[PDB]
């Protein structure tokens, strides 16, 4: 999509099975943890990181990328 | 060149060094990386690398001067290595000490050829042979000096007529060292070899005819009974052939495959030189390396080695047939034909035809760039390490191999000499019992032959150890000098009958095997066993310990004393029985001492028989039998136990071990009588784990039966004989069921038997095992 | 870049005997020439080439090339690495009028991979055009003679075609000594070679030989030997077209591709320890050796990721061991700091640096292909061209 | 030692062997073990009118001869005369 309409902004409220509601298989982190790259390649998109939020202590890492820390990988932090 | 070209030729000592072989496989393109690997150990060399030894030693035999030609139109026409049976291979530090002779030199009218062969021995064992065959080509007339020799396709000989060993008997040549003999119903096998000293290419000056002649037993294990030796002059033919070829066959131990099988159609490269072979072998023929020899030879130029070739293709193969292994190959064969140059590729086909004594039997054939072909032969490979089981009763079903009783001419001799046997001798054919499972069967004892054979079946004794009494015990009752007849019951069918199962299947596996023996599909150094009942099956198939006959007639006997220990209600049904039992499903930690914990239990506690039989496979099957009250009873406290899933392991190791034994005890003698109120005609069901076996009412393989067993060993004693034995096929190959180690004669073996039997004549041998010290 | 990213690298010289020959002529044959003096001045080396090692004949006539089995092989094959990367240094620093010593002078460092080191610290003396040749020599005959050493101590055998056949259908290749095993770390594959070895002897032994990245791994060992652990993989796999999207994460099967390289001889194993030592002889009875004072810059071990200049004794000795003997931790070294890098070694498109990027990606560094001319859309890293623009075009920078 | 002693040891051995086969249980499991794993065999042949070894293989095998099966590349085949005739006479058609 994003290649496609490369101006206009584009969010990406991911989340995993984690979150209340509907609710997928998928770990919250492994497929972020393998494609923030691929994302970063497109600035038309807004990232944002749920399931699984209450506070900040909770979220400040995801927003400093010093979870990708402990996975041993270069730190993602998170635009929303 | 005054060498006795009849003499033998002595070669000389040569040790192996790992930097010969390492060289010798480069110079051929042996890239099997199993002949090589780190330096310092026993690396094991090629079949081959046996020529380099054999060379000097192989051709001492064609200077002489009185065999006499040109070295240089000389042709190498074929060559083979036969690795003999029970050598090893060869490897590095295997010094070897190499002989040779001339088999034959014979004078056609295009030259002359000269057949070598030639023997290896480490530590004085022979360890293989090589056949060469060269061809001086030209035109020669010293036959003075020519001769032939060869051994001939062993022949077979059919005697059922009286007539015919009269004309043999008329004869000079076969002599014997009893001419008291028998010799009707009887099959001789003529292993013969021929030597000849020739005047002329077609008409003979002196004839030798010599060989043994064996005889089948009732196992077919040929033994000798005389010899050949025919002596002659001027001949134009050989008789001692002649009288057997359209009297007798040929007993061909190979066989064809039904359709052939192609492996493989290959390619290679020879060298661009011949050098370094030439350097390996020390085959310094110019022929491959100068030029101005071959020119001299009015050849294309400087060939490649044959010998090179023979390498190539066999490594070619060892790969691919053998899957790189080299040990399985023990023979190989190849035939020139025409000669190849350095730098040419060819299509060397592969193609799996023949069977021979259990391995296989291959051909090759090398064709050329232009599509013509140089190379061919065959190839003696042996097959992967193999094993043979046999089943057990149970397995049983109608028209069980009579499918093939119709087809495999080995198995109905098989089934007849036995169905026959039994006819003569206890009144009743199986192949009227196979087809067709009969509920009954009535046997009349007729005339002459019906007393025969009611006495036959009275003259049987149910000895049974009591006492230590040998108790001289009648096994039929009902029958008696005033009887005429008799009756055998079997509700659903007597092929539901141990009675009559264990026979049939004996017959059948017996009856395969041999169809097998004769397609040659049977190794020597094979494997064999059974399960509590193809151990007889395996011991004649294997070994030919003993005929067809003895062996059922025993297998008979066994089958009756199994059923008699126990006994039946009006049919024959009794309140033994036996069940199959999986740990794995009461519990995946159900463990092989679970079942101890919890048939024990029922054992001591109802006082009635349960035992495990037969250890199947660990944690997964293991078969009890014994009092079906208490056996039905273990399965209720396993279905119980299952649904509750109380893991007797985590009583073991939650409760003290001894605790666990009143728990238990409680749990047992609960289940038993919540169980053991079943009516007499029990009826036996899968729960959750264990499994009947009906067709089965007899707890066999469990110590209620210890006392059946000197009956039969006596019978056995009697009806095998210690020569018709061979060790050669048990040391290993063998394996008991009693003891699941590979038969093996020794203390320790006999020990390991005693102890757990406690019998005599183990502890009176290793008492007087010193008899072994001759 | 070391071994073990392509099939034929022998190709990636036709460019340089073919594009740059008028640049590199005089170097190759240099290098050939030397070459065939190791083979003759050698005592035994005229068997293992059996068709020989005249190459500049294999390059005019394609025709003239043996194939792989013979030219992937290792002491035919390692120094036509090492050379075919010094040629692509050579042209660079050419094209910038650079002479060696002047390029060195502009880098952090360097490093290797399995072999591509000795290469490295080779530049790490260059200071000419002149006293080139002489670390070409250096350390073409450290390739050689390591190959060498080394197809003896545990040469090629053919493999039987039973395995050769189920391999294809089970979605592998030709086996060889060495494994690659992605989506997978360090420890799982210990537990597997633990187990597969608990059956099997030393000289069967198989071990980890390459942490290449944290899942892509790579072992070493008897095609036997490996071909048995890939069975015992078998076991696990779980066909990337399963679609276990319908199962939870932690409830799902460890599905990962995994396969042989194109190598012919086990690196960083025990298999080849015995030959070490008989290089370190084949080399002082040559007049090779390496110093500290001569590198100025830092080279790091694929092992400790420390400097050699930082060393208590010889380095080739070192450099060796770490090439048959010990495995590298390829971020263990790669623990510098940079902006960008530049492999020269082979494969280029499948070489080292696309994997280093693959982990160094998120870390703000720039990788390219110094190889070959060619395009990558995404423009995640880069190649040749994009070394010698003088524009901005070329200062591209990765975040 | 001397053939014809040891025959005759062997003959005796052999006897009780049989004899007492009849009561002490099978050891299967120690068979099935040793010929399959201290000789290595390749083949196992099932010679009966049904296949049961063959289902009492294949399931020891993989159930405590997997590791060790694909540890040294083994194909170990177990067939039956029942239902493998081919895969025994080696006369399958393409």
Known sequence: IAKAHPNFPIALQWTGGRGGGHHSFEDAHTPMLQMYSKIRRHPNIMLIFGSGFGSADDTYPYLTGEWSTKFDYPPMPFDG | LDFDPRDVIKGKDFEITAKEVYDFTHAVGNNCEDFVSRPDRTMLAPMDFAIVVGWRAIIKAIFPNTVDGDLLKLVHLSNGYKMIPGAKPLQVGDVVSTTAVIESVVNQPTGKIVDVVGTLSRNGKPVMEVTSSFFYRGNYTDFENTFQKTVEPVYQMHIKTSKDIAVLRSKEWFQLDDEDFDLLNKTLTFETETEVTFKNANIFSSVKCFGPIKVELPTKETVEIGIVDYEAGASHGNPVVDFLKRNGSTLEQKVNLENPIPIAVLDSYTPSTNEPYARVSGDLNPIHVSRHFASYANLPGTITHGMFSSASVRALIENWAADSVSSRVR?????????????????????????????????FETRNEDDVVVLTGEAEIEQPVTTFVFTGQGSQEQGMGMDLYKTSKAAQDVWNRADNHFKDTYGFSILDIVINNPVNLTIHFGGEKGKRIRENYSAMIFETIVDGKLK????????????????????????????????????????????????????????????????????????????????????????????????????????????????????????????????????KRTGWLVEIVNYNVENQQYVAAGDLRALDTVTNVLNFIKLQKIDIIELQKSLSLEEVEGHLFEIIDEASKKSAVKPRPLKLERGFACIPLVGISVPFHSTYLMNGVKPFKSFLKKNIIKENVKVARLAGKYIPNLTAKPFQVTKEYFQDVYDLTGSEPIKEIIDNWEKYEQ | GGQGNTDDYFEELRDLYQTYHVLVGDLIKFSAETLSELIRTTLDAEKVFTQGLNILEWLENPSNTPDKDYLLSIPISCPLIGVIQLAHYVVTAKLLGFTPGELRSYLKGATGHSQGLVTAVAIAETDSWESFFVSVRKAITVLFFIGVR?????????LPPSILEDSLENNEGVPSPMLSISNLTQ???????????????????????????AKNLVVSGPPQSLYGLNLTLRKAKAPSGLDQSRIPFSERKLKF??????????????????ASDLINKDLVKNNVSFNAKDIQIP?????????????????????????????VKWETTTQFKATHILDFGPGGASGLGVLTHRNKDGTGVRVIVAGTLDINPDDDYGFKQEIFDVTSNGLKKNP | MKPEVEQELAHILLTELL??????????????????????????????PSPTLAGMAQRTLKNKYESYDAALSLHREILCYSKDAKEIYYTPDP
């Open chain 2, 331 to 363: 023979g190989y064969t190849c035939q020139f034909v025409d000669m190849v140059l350095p730098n040419t590729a060819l299509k060397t086909s592969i193609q799996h035809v023949g069977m021979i004594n259990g391995r296989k039997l291959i051909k």
């Open chain 2, 472 to 603: 001289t015990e009648k096994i039929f009752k009902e029958i008696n000098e005033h009887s005429t007849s008799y009756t055998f019951r079997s509700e659903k069918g007597l092929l539901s009958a141990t009675q009559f199962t264990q026979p049939a299947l004996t017959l059948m596996e017996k009856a395969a095997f041999e169809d097998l023996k004769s397609k040659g599909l049977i190794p020597a150094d094979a494997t064999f066993a059974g399960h509590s009942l193809g151990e007889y099956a395996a011991l004649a198939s294997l070994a030919d310990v003993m005929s067809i006959e003895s062996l059922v007639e025993v297998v008979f006997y066994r089958g009756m004393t199994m059923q008699v220990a126990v006994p039946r209600d009006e049919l024959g049904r009794s309140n033994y029985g036996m069940i199959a039992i999986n740990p794995g499903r009461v519990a995946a930690s159900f463990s092989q001492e679970a079942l101890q914990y919890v048939v024990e239990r029922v054992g």
């Open chain 3, 150 to 158: 080394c197809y003896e101590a545990y040469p090629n055998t053919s």
């Open chain 3, 187 to 213: 420890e799982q594959v210990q537990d597997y070679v633990n187990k597969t070895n608990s059956h099997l002897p030393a000289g069967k032994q198989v071990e980890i030989s390459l942490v290449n990245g």
């Open chain 3, 257 to 274: 591709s995994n396969r042989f390289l194109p190598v012919a001889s086990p690196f960083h194993s025990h298999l080849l320890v015995p």
């Open chain 3, 299 to 327: 080279v790091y071990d694929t092992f400790d990721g420390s400097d050699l200049r930082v060393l208590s004794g010889s380095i080739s000795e070192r450099i060796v061991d770490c090439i048959i003997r010990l495995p």
């Open chain 4, 19 to 48: 004899a007492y086969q009849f009561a002490s249980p099978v050891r299967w499991i120690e068979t099935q073990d040793v010929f399959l794993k201290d000789f290595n065999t390749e083949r196992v042949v099932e010679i009966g």
